[PDB]
Amino acid sequence: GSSEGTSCNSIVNGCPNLDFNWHMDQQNIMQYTLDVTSVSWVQDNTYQITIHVKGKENIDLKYLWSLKIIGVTGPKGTVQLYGYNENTYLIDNPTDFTATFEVYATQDVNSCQVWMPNFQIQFEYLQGSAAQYASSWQWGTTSFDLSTGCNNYDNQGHSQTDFPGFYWNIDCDNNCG
Ligand code: NA
Ligand code: NA
Ligand code: NA
Ligand code: NA
Ligand code: NA
Numbered sequence: 001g002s003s004e005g006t007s008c009n010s011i012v013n014g015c016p017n018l019d020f021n022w023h024m025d026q027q028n029i030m031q032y033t034l035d036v037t038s039v040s041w042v043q044d045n046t047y048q049i050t051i052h053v054k055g056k057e058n059i060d061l062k063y064l065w066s067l068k069i070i071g072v073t074g075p076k077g078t079v080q081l082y083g084y085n086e087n088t089y090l091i092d093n094p095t096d097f098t099a100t101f102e103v104y105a106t107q108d109v110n111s112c113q114v115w116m117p118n119f120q121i122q123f124e125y126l127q128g129s130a131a132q133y134a135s136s137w138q139w140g141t142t143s144f145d146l147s148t149g150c151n152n153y154d155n156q157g158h159s160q161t162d163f164p165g166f167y168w169n170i171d172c173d174n175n176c177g
């Protein structure tokens with residue numbers, strides 16, 4: 001049985017004035033960005049969201065061993081994006097990719113809007129058969145997790161996450177308020 005999605009009009013970066021770059025720089029991780037490009041209410045407090053992740057420089061797919069979204073509060077806690085072990089090949093560029101998955105978004109920003117539940121993206125470069133390309137690797141730390149959120153920052157405006165948190169309208173009711 002199918003249902004009509006309800007698209008959210010306003011998807012808000014909840015903390016655009018934090019310095020996220022610092023947290024990747026401190027770990028010698030190349031800078032990445034994340035945007036939430038669409039949100040649709042499915043039913044209950046479940047939303048289908050699409051993310052777009054970009055790296056500062058282009059890293060060829062050959063360097064990648066695995067990529068997965070972890071720590072997801074949703075129907076699936078893990079969303080495999082790439083991995084030989086898991087026969088999963090759902091992205092072609094670890095430095096410019098999209099993913100669509102479901103989350104349960106329940107923590108209120110206000111009476112009309114809820115926060116995205118935060119998650120991490122686990123990158124493994126140069127492992128397994130990708131280790132053969134080590135000599136041309138030039139982008140710093142090779143295995144790392146990048147986290148989302150607006151709730152973890154130092155006393156000088158640096159985030160201790162790598163990507164902003166986001167919020168949107170409850171049930172994607174664009175007429176709330
Ligand atoms: Na709609
Ligand atoms: Na979506
Ligand atoms: Na998966
Ligand atoms: Na809040
Ligand atoms: Na409020």
Ligand code: NA
Nearest residue numbers: 154155156157
């Ligand atoms: Na201090």
